[PDB]
């Protein structure tokens, strides 16, 4: 016979819950989600308020900082210390000129003396912050060679004519030696020479050491690989010509596997603020002290009125000080209780039988 197969799937008789949203099931569900999210919101804000951060903008250090120590204008620095809420002891900055640097747009050394009144714990992250540097335009974020990130001695057509991601405005120079970290992302790599320590101002042989190791993920060394170009095949990018004044020698070619500041730069920031790790110390903790950052100024930001800064923090597990997750778990927790309140009171002062509001039998 023809007789379709009867097996509770083809008969559309699968086992099923058929959920009916009575106020006996939904109003305690709101209160339960309201209870968790004021607790998760209370415990996120509590841990977030302990996140101490030092943000010092130094884009104006060639201009507004003298050769002497002057307090930075309060426009530039933001200090958050939860043990010291009314903390206003301003950081200092001075500018050593370096007339041999011959660049004059961003040269010299911005020495920055901040005073953290509370110690940061074991991981101490020195981040540089870039504001208004737009690393998220569509030509910018596609401009590199993935062959050359992967350590390949890639030809001209694989760095320039690669279909998604190519080094398109910056493939090769005038004499045809291709740029080894080609593309706009590698070219515009944030120079500024950050030190390998914080100099403890007012203490001898207790300089808080920093390191450029442990700066990217360890796993990017699977993707970032040592290059296979001869030194005859490659040139530095055009804005790296001051780092390598003579092109690439037999020994000066940067192994981008070890060079993590490149690897952090080559991850373009999603948004208009850009925070990239440049110096970490995973070994020791940073005491309550007055410390000094000598930044070799090489990265111009003022011609686009952008900011350029230092972000010295020990984050939380949620990363950084940001009140959003704590506030908005509270808001969603206070909203689920407010609407457990509105719907319960409307169910008492209205409310109906669960059997006959049907339009047919009126």
């Amino acid at each position: 016979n023809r007789r379709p197969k009867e097996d509770a799937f083809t008969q559309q008789r699968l086992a099923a819950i058929n959920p009916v949203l009575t106020p006996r099931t939904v109003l305690p569900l709101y209160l339960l989600i309201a209870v968790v999210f004021v607790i998760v919101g209370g415990c996120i804000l509590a841990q977030n308020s302990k996140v101490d951060e030092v943000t010092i903008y130094y884009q104006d250090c060639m201009t507004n900082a003298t050769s002497s120590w002057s307090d930075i204008p309060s426009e530039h620095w933001q200090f958050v210390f939860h043990k010291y809420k009314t903390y206003n002891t301003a950081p200092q900055w001075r500018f050593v000129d370096d007339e041999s640097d011959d660049f004059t747009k961003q040269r010299g050394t911005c020495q920055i003396r901040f005073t953290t009144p509370s110690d940061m714990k074991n991981n101490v992250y020195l981040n540089y912050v870039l504001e208004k540097f737009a690393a998220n335009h569509r030509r910018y974020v596609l401009s590199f060679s993935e062959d050359q990130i992967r350590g390949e001695d890639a030809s001209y057509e694989t760095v320039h004519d690669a279909t998604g991601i190519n080094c398109k405005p910056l493939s090769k120079n005038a004499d045809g030696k291709i740029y080894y970290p080609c593309g706009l992302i590698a070219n515009s790599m944030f120079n500024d020479t950050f030190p390998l320590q914080l100099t403890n101002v007012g203490d001898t042989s207790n300089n808080y050491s920093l390191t450029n190791k442990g700066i990217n993920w360890e796993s990017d060394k699977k993707r970032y690989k040592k290059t296979k170009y001869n030194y005859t095949q490659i040139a530095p990018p055009p804005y790296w010509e001051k780092m390598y004044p003579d092109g690439y020698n037999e020994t000066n070619i940067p192994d981008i596997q070890d060079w993590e500041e490149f690897q952090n730069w080559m991850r373009p920031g999603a948004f208009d603020k850009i925070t990239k790790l440049i110096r970490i110390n995973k070994n020791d903790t940073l005491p309550a002290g007055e410390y000094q950052l000598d930044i070799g100024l090489h990265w111009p930001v003022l011609e686009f009125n952008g900011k350029k800064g230092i972000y010295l923090t020990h984050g939380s597990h949620l990363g950084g000080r940001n009140p959003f997750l704590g506030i908005v778990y509270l808001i969603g927790g206070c909203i689920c209780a407010a609407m457990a309140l509105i719907l319960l009171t409307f169910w008492l002062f209205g409310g109906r039988k669960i059997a006959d509001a049907s339009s047919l039998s009126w």
């Binding site: 559309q12 699968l14 058929n18 981040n127 912050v129 910018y140 993935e146 686009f304 952008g306």
Partner: protein, 1158 residues
């Protein structure tokens, strides 16, 4: 166009066409019934898919992939999603259409008999002559129905369908008469006498017809079933004179008809293929886009308007960025030309169209195509729509309109064979004012007061059937009927003048008829009744069962086995039944009691009650006037039960006054006064004073669940309009037995009598309906109408009530106000025209169920079209969208599957556009932060896999498997069907609120991850950096997929394990994909996203607060809806939770007669 069929004769000089001599090029005798002939399958189907507006859009995205200005990576591979979707939709529409071709190939291979004589209408790539030798190899060979041609002699044997339009040459019956079951072409339950032409009546064998030369000068194909004009012309033999015999519609076998009660019927094939009247009423099977599917384009257009707004926002906001001054792109990007940009946001408008192109999603039409195919696959696969008696499941033949079945407001049912079972049963009679017959036909009108504990009277009548069969068990040699006896009256006893009347009533039923007797081949001692009307087949079979077996016929008269012993009755005259007579008389010769005297005679009149009660005797002394009140009281009782009534009347005539009548009958007979009505008026003189024997009642048997189904369709708010090709009082009998017509009703007959007649009582019944014409007010009202008015229109008055715009409007308005609408004697064109009247002038969903070819226009014209399957191969089954085996399966098809398929897709399509724009709008909201420059938030595999793998199946397993209530509760509560009649579940209003909820939740989907990055861009526990835009797009995607699928889950009634698993795996493939892909070096910027982002606790902290904020404003509104303004199905589910429906069995079927008691 006048065509001239030549037979056995070369064509005249009008054959100038070479490479094939005949010019007129007749159609092959094939039924097409398929949506696409394969020469234009692929052109028509691509246009059908590109009548959808989003497909036009996707094709434009591909054409604008070829420009390098847009910068699209591998534009040619971007056409692969549209190309496979157009092909997978075309293959599904080819397999759908090929299932129609296998029924075209069955009908075209149905093996008629075609004469093997050479036919001069072939393509390249004294009428019988006795002097010609009877050559070999002219036999009527079994050739194919597809191989029938115009000009082809076809011997149609007994009991097979007629392959084309055939003008009879001969039948096996002498005097060349034929019989045809025209319930395919009409709703006529009777057989039609077709006459062979008197010229060709003497043709008998294939040797005779091969030596016969003629031609037929005929009129063209003209679609009117009750008209034919042709002129058969043939050369006289041994005399050069051309003779003429006119051909009309009682000399034509039309293609729906089946040859009945005749051994063979030889005829010339006149029209073939699409020329046949059966097919001029049909059209090509329309492609039939669903109403939700048609209004999806205005939903698609709103998304284009939103798409145009956002690309316009991004086009102007980017072109404003490029002529800013202090921007880092001057130094670090090499856009070192400050000039060359005045307003070049025109490129960034069009970059944004590619950036936001998934705001109108490629997986839309292929989602709804998978939905509708699988909704067709589940209708085919359930067994409560399976007819075991035919071995036939419900066959969805249009695989895209299951949701049309959920909004249906007007069912334009046929009656005969659709409502009826084509069985006529003698259920009741009256003899001498005494009601006989126990039938439980329509005592179930009373479901208002008394119970369904009356399964007992089915058993009570059944014991009375057996007790009657034991009581009537006298040895009657041809009353083999123990099973074909359908008159249970235990009062066959002798309480007598009543017993003498009960013997003589059934004697008149065995005498007065035109029923023949043929020997059955299986049990040749049992002989079965070959009747024209199955009324009389039921009358003679019930006389056969109660003793008075009509067993044979002689040249003298009839032989009636009268209670075991045979008696010859000498029939003096038969006054034949006629359409205008509405009666039939029979004169028998009463034998002699005194020797040497020629004895008397007995007229017996049978016919309609109202015109036999006119012709009764008033000059009496006996009880001839005493019983007229009782028999009329019962024939009123019988018709309210929906039974065909009749009356038997007699007058015992004297031997000479009959002989004066029989002489005056022979005056009109021997003269050429047959066309004159004197032969009727001579019959009128003897039928004036009649003694009323009593009446009969015949159940025109409905199909099994017909009055229960129509009650469920009326409780659903659907209004059944019966549209029939047969008579008015026939469809009133079916109307009462169906509970359509309801004795308290005022039946509003239109009844033209002869042209503004019709409008005045259209206006007159429009004062008891206190309204004139206003139909814009009417299409606001979708309630089932209240006043007990039934409208009955003759078909011929409906030709005038559908002529112009003004009378169509008041005729529509009255029919909309009447509870029962019966359009009788309606041609196939006007049944379709009534649907096209209602479907256009009101904005309503129309059904039109029917079996037969007179319904095929109606079925093709409506929004669904249902065929009712039978033993034969039916055009209404082939030409339809669904095909059920019984009528009562319509309640399971409309109230369960349609009402599901409506609500499944009405929720799915807003859920789908919600689903897409919760993701595609973060490509917009990231534009605020990249200056609308056009960089992608999302890694490229996420953009492929969002609508393909991450969220595709939960919407798909809502559109296929969601049930608001059970399949039983869909039938217990038919009023849940009213939200689709009121069109409540699919609105552009509901759609705009899903867009506004999709707008909102994508603000949550982007900005909740933006607001964890925005402050200091460190979101990782170890500070190492997740600030790639693709990593932020893992945050956004994962909120998007989980708050898509749980939104789809929370709007799914009936959380089953199959959908809830594939919602969970959907939710877990977005974690599984980026775990797998972002462990490979080919991820290429994305390389360890899942190790880094899923190991970052900020991801898990954004994830649960943003899924809250996405789902909560809709989940609040639903909780505020379902507590305070609940829909009816939200309350019926609450009762189902409480167990108002758990005493019903699984698969409860209210139209099933063999259902358990609840």
């Amino acid at each position: 166009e006048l065509r001239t069929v030549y037979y056995n004769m070369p064509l005249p000089k009008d054959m100038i066409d070479e490479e094939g001599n005949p010019i007129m090029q007749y159609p092959r005798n094939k039924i097409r019934t398929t949506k696409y002939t394969p020469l234009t399958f692929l052109p028509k189907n691509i246009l059908f898919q590109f009548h959808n507006f989003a497909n036009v859009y996707f094709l434009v995205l591909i054409i604008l992939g070829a420009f390098q200005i847009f910068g699209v990576t591998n534009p040619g591979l971007s056409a692969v999603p549209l190309v496979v979707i157009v092909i997978i939709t075309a293959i599904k529409d080819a397999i759908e259409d090929s299932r129609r071709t296998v029924l075209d190939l069955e009908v075209n291979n149905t093996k008629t008999h075609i004469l093997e004589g050479v036919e001069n209408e072939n393509v390249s790539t004294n009428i019988v002559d006795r002097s010609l030798p009877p050559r070999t190899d002219c036999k009527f060979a079994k050739n194919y129905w597809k191989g029938v041609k115009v000009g082809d002699i076809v011997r149609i044997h007994n009991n097979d369908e007629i392959p084309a339009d055939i003008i009879l040459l001969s039948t096996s019956d002498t005097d060349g008469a034929c019989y045809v079951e025209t319930k395919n072409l009409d709703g006529e339950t009777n057989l039609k006498v077709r006459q062979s032409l008197k010229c060709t009546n003497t043709i008998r064998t294939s040797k005779d017809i091969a030596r016969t030369k003629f031609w037929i000068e005929s009129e063209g194909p003209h679609s009117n079933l009750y008209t034919y004009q042709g002129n058969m012309k043939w050369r006289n033999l041994a005399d050069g004179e051309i003779r003429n015999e006119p051909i009309t519609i009682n000399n034509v076998l039309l293609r729906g008809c089946t040859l009945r009660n005749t051994k063979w019927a030889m005829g010339v094939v006149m029209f073939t293929g699409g020329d046949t009247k059966i097919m001029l009423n049909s059209g090509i099977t329309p492609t039939k886009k669903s109403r939700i599917s048609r209004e999806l384009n205005f939903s698609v257009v709103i998304n284009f308007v939103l798409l145009f707004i956002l690309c316009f926002v991004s086009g102007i906001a980017n072109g404003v960025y490029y002529d800013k001054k202090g921007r880092s792109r001057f130094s670090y990007e090499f856009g070192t030309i400050a000039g060359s940009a005045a307003t070049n946001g025109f490129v960034s408008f069009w970059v944004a169209v590619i950036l936001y192109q998934s705001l109108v999603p490629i997986s839309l039409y292929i989602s709804v195509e998978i939905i509708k195919t699988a909704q067709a696959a589940f209708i085919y696969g359930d067994v409560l729509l399976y007819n075991a008696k035919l071995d036939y499941p419900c066959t969805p033949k249009s695989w895209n309109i299951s949701d049309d079945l959920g909004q249906v407001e007007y069912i334009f049912s046929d009656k005969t064979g659709t409502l009826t079972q084509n069985v006529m049963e003698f259920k009741k009679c009256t003899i001498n004012g005494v009601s006989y017959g126990r039938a439980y036909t329509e005592a179930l009108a009373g479901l208002r007061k008394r119970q369904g504990i009356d399964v007992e009277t089915e058993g009570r009548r059944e014991k009375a059937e057996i007790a009657k069969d034991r009581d009537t068990m006298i040895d009657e040699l041809r009353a083999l009927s123990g099973n074909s006896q359908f008159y249970p009256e235990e009062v066959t006893f002798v309480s007598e003048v009543q017993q003498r009347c009960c013997e003589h009533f059934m004697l008149a039923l065995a005498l007065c008829h035109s029923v023949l007797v043929e020997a059955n081949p299986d049990n040749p001692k049992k002989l079965d009744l070959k009747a024209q009307s199955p009324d009389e087949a039921a009358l003679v079979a019930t006389a056969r069962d109660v003793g008075f077996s009509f067993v044979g016929k002689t040249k003298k008269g009839l032989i009636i086995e009268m209670q075991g012993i045979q008696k010859e009755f000498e029939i003096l005259n038969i006054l034949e039944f006629n359409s205008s007579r509405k009666r039939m008389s029979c004169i028998v010769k009463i034998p002699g009691l005194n020797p040497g005297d020629e004895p008397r005679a007995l007229l017996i009149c049978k016919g309609a009650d109202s015109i036999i009660y006119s012709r009764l005797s008033r000059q009496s002394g006996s009880n001839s006037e005493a019983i007229l009140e009782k028999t009329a009281l019962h024939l009123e009782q019988y018709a309210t039960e929906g039974l065909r009534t009749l009356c038997i009347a007699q007058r015992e005539l004297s031997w000479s006054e009959y002989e004066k009548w029989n002489e005056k009958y022979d005056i009109a007979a021997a003269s050429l006064a047959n066309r004159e009505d004197e032969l009727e008026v001579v019959a009128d003189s003897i039928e004036r004073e009649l003694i009323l024997l009593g009446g009969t009642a015949i159940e025109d048997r409905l199909q099994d669940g017909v009055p229960d189904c129509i009650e469920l369709l009326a409780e659903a708010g659907i209004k059944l309009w019966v549209l029939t090709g047969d008579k008015v009082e026939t469809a009133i009998n079916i109307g009462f037995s169906c509970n359509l017509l309801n004795n308290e009703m005022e039946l509003l007959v239109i009844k033209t009598t002869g042209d503004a007649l019709l409008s005045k009582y259209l206006k007159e019944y429009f004062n008891l309906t206190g309204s004139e014409e206003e139909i814009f007010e009417a299409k606001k009202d979708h309630e089932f109408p209240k006043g007990n008015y039934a409208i009955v229109i003759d078909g011929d008055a409906l030709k005038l009530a559908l002529y112009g715009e003004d009378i169509r409007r008041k005729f529509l308005l009255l029919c909309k106000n009447c509870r029962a609408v019966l359009c009788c004697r309606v041609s196939p064109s006007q049944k379709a025209a009534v649907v096209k009247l209602v479907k256009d002038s009101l904005d309503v969903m129309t059904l039109a169920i029917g079996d037969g070819s007179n319904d095929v226009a109606m079925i093709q014209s409506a929004d669904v079209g249902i065929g009712i399957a039978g033993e034969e191969g039916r055009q209404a089954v082939m030409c339809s969208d669904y095909a059920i085996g019984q009528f009562r399966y319509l309640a399971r098809l409309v109230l369960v599957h349609g009402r599901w398929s409506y609500k499944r897709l009405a929720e799915m399509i807003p859920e789908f556009f919600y689903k897409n724009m919760i993701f595609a709008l973060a490509l917009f909201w990231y534009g605020i932060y990249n200056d609308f420059d056009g960089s992608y938030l999302y890694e490229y595999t996420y953009m492929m896999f969002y609508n393909l793998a991450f969220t595709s199946l939960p919407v798909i397993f809502l559109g296929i498997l969601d049930q608001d209530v059970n399949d039983t509760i869909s039938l217990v509560v038919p009023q849940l069907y009213r939200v689709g009649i009121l069109r409540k579940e699919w609105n552009q209003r509901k759609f705009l609120w899903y867009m506004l909820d999709g707008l909102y939740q994508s603000i949550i989907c982007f900005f909740f991850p933006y607001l964890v990055y925005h402050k200091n861009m460190i979101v990782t526990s170890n500070g190492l950096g997740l600030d790639h835009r693709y990593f932020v797009g893992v945050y956004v995607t994962t909120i998007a997929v989980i708050s898509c699928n749980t939104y789809v889950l929370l709007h799914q009634y009936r959380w089953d394990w199959f959908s809830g698993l594939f919602i969970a795996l959907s939710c877990l493939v977005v974690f599984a994909w980026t775990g797998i892909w972002s462990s490979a070096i080919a991820s290429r910027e994305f390389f360890k996203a899942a190790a880094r982002i899923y190991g970052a606790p900020s991801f898990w902290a954004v994830f649960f607060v943003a899924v809250l904020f996405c789902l909560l404003p809709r989940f609040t509104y639903d909780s505020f809806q379902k507590f305070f303004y609940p829909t009816d199905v939200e309350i019926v589910r609450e009762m189902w939770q409480h167990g108002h429906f758990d005493h019903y069995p699984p698969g409860y079927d209210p139209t099933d007669p063999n259902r358990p008691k609840v």
